[PDB]
């Protein structure tokens, strides 16, 4: 269950990493 | 691809007519012999059991070849006449040369060399005939032999004919006997085998053929037995089927 620990908290901090950008989302010669 | 003639080898190297002679064995009449001391027997299947024949020949597969040897046969029929004439002539020439009966293994190897003479050369058809051997000697007693179109001969105690008889050899192994030399036991075993392998319902005795070879006092008589004992053997085996359905 140590691998469960490993992969689980890895993906959880990855979910945080997604939440980071999710919350951080907020003519003269041509026209 | 590499079909054309019996010669030359295939690129692995295997043979063409050898395998196909075996597959010419497989569609023929079914024979077998049994393990017995103090006697030996043969079984044979009647091809063409149609009602308009004569049966005046007393023997269609057995050929009493010397005096104390007969042989069953399987394969293309008229090649076997060519083989039996030559085989009788070989054994009789041996007896002419020595005045002693032929001790059967050099007889078998002589016929195997005859067959092998058409396996090597070109271009001739190999003999598509396998056939059995029963006999007696001064050196081993009762014997059984299996000729093959390659020229190989295997001394068996329970033999093999083609596609109809693989399940027969399976029954011979699963019902292997040793020690019991009684001819009647072997006859009941042969009745059981031919009951399973032949598709003749209830095993009509006109569709079978049984010949035996016993040693009587100094004679080694060959008993191509008649039909009434075959009938009562079938009745014996069906009474033993009644014994087999005492389990219900």
């Amino acid at each position: 269950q140590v691998e469960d620990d490993i992969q689980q908290l890895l993906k959880k901090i990855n979910e945080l990493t997604g939440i980071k950008e999710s919350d951080t989302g907020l003519l003269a010669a041509d026209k | 691809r590499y079909d054309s003639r019996t010669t030359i080898f295939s690129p692995e190297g295997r043979l063409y007519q050898v395998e196909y002679a075996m597959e010419a064995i497989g569609h023929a009449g079914t024979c077998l012999g049994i393990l017995a001391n103090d006697g030996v027997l043969l079984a044979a299947e009647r091809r063409n059991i149609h009602k308009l024949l004569d049966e005046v020949f007393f023997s269609e597969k057995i050929y009493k070849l010397n005096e104390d040897m007969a042989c069953s046969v399987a394969g293309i029929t008229s090649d076997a006449n060519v083989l039996t004439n030559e085989l009788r002539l070989i054994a009789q020439r041996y007896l002419l040369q020595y005045q002693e009966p032929i001790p059967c293994e050099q007889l078998v190897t002589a016929l195997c060399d005859i067959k092998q003479a058409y396996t090597q050369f070109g271009g001739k058809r190999p003999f598509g005939v396998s056939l059995l051997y029963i006999g007696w000697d001064k050196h081993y007693g009762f014997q059984l032999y299996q000729s093959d179109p390659s020229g190989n001969y295997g001394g068996w105690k329970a033999t093999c004919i083609g596609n109809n008889s693989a399940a027969a050899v399976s029954m011979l192994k699963q019902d292997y006997k040793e020690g019991e030399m009684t001819l009647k036991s072997a006859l009941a075993l042969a009745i059981k085998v031919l009951n399973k392998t032949m598709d003749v319902s209830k095993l009509s005795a006109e569709k079978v053929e049984i010949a035996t070879l016993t040693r009587e006092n100094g004679k080694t008589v060959i008993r191509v037995l008649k039909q009434k004992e075959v009938e009562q053997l079938i009745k014996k085996h069906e009474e033993e089927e009644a014994k087999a359905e005492r389990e219900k």
Binding site: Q7, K11, E15, L27, D30, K31 | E19, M22, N152
Partner: protein
């Protein structure tokens, strides 16, 4: 409990896959364009701000250019953005190709490295030295002036792991990768051989150092002699197109090709020459020494009562594939799962060994050398 983690990882990867201007200058770009944009074909560019185009219906016009980005980026042969009012030349089309480019582009390394197959590491060592060494450690090729090999053919009896070798090399890579089942060219379309070919290899050159992976075209090696009395279809012409694309002119670049076949003598020997395709690799029915490793991999994470010896089965019969070993290791597990049991005994392996091995049936000797 880990299944929650894997589901959350997959759904967050999908969330990231969903996570994929000018207040007035961009609106002037929105009026530099007519919103129903279109796809055209430049024939010439007379550079005095109006160009001649060509359409998919074939009407070709002096149409003025409206540059926001550098207008000299697009060329005759590169498409444009034309309006429906005057078909006005709008601007920047990053060079797009067929729909059939992303189709053949695997975006994952879904399986694992050399730690997946069991034991062939002489020729696994070869494909190692011919892909993993030129990519990752490209020292000695420059440092002894010797060019790396290009083409690798997989062959032998099927189910040796040719697919497994393919996906294994599809793991351990940073170079871009493409997946082509190369027999896809069964149309009733004349031409259309070179379209897929030229666009595939143009894409391959434009992205990166890459592998261009053709898979199972052993049927298509059409004997290199004719078709008999009347044949000619397109298939010879298409394979000759691929041949000229490979080892004609127009220097190959940093492009790699790995190929795989089941039967090999029916191929086209105008391809199998070195230089055009460099390496050939046998994948035979291995041994009775790495069968232990294939059983070891296939009994890595399964419930096996260790009383039984798979080496008994290896001692039984000696010629079968590793896929047969996988079939046995799953099938004996099913035979164990007949009646809700924990682990697998010997006789499930026996019945499964017999069950899977209903393959070879011939007949009648030999058998009779003897």
């Amino acid at each position: 409990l880990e299944r929650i983690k894997d589901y959350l990882l997959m759904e967050e990867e999908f969330i990231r896959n969903q996570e994929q201007k000018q207040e007035e200058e961009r609106s002037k770009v929105d009026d530099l364009r007519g919103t129903p944009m279109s796809v055209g074909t430049l024939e010439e560019i007379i550079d005095d701000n109006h160009a001649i185009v060509s359409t998919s219906v074939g009407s070709e016009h002096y149409v003025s250019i409206l540059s926001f980005v550098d207008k000299d980026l697009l060329e005759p042969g590169c498409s444009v953005l034309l309006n429906h009012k005057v078909h006005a030349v709008i601007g920047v089309l990053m060079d797009d190709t067929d729909p059939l480019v992303t189709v053949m582009k695997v975006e994952k390394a879904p399986q694992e490295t050399y730690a997946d197959i069991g034991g062939l590491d002489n020729q696994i060592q070869e494909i190692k030295e011919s892909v993993e060494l030129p990519l990752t450690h490209p020292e000695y090729y420059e440092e002894m002036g010797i060019k790396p090999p290009k083409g690798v053919i997989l062959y032998g009896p099927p189910g040796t792991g040719k697919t497994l070798l393919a996906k294994a090399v599809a793991n351990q890579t940073s170079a871009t990768f493409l997946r082509v089942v190369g027999s896809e060219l069964i149309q009733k379309y004349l031409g259309d051989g070179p379209k897929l070919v030229r666009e595939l290899f143009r894409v391959a050159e434009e992205h990166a150092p890459s592998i261009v992976f053709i898979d199972e075209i052993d049927a298509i090696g059409t004997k290199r002699y004719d078709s008999n009395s009347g044949g000619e279809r397109e298939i010879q012409r298409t394979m000759l197109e691929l041949l000229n694309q490979l080892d004609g002119f127009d220097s190959r670049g940093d492009v790699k090709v790995i190929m795989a076949t089941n039967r090999i003598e029916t191929l086209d020997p105008a391809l199998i020459r070195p230089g055009r395709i460099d390496r050939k690799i046998e994948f035979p029915l291995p041994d009775e020494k790495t069968k232990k490793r294939i059983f070891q991999i296939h009994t890595s994470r399964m419930t096996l009562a260790d009383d039984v010896t798979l080496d008994d089965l290896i001692m039984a019969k000696d010629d079968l594939s590793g896929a047969d070993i996988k079939a046995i290791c799953t099938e004996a597990g099913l035979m164990a799962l007949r009646e809700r049991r924990m682990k697998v005994t010997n006789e499930d392996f026996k019945k499964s060994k017999e069950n899977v091995l209903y393959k070879k049936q011939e007949g009648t000797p030999e058998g009779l050398y003897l």
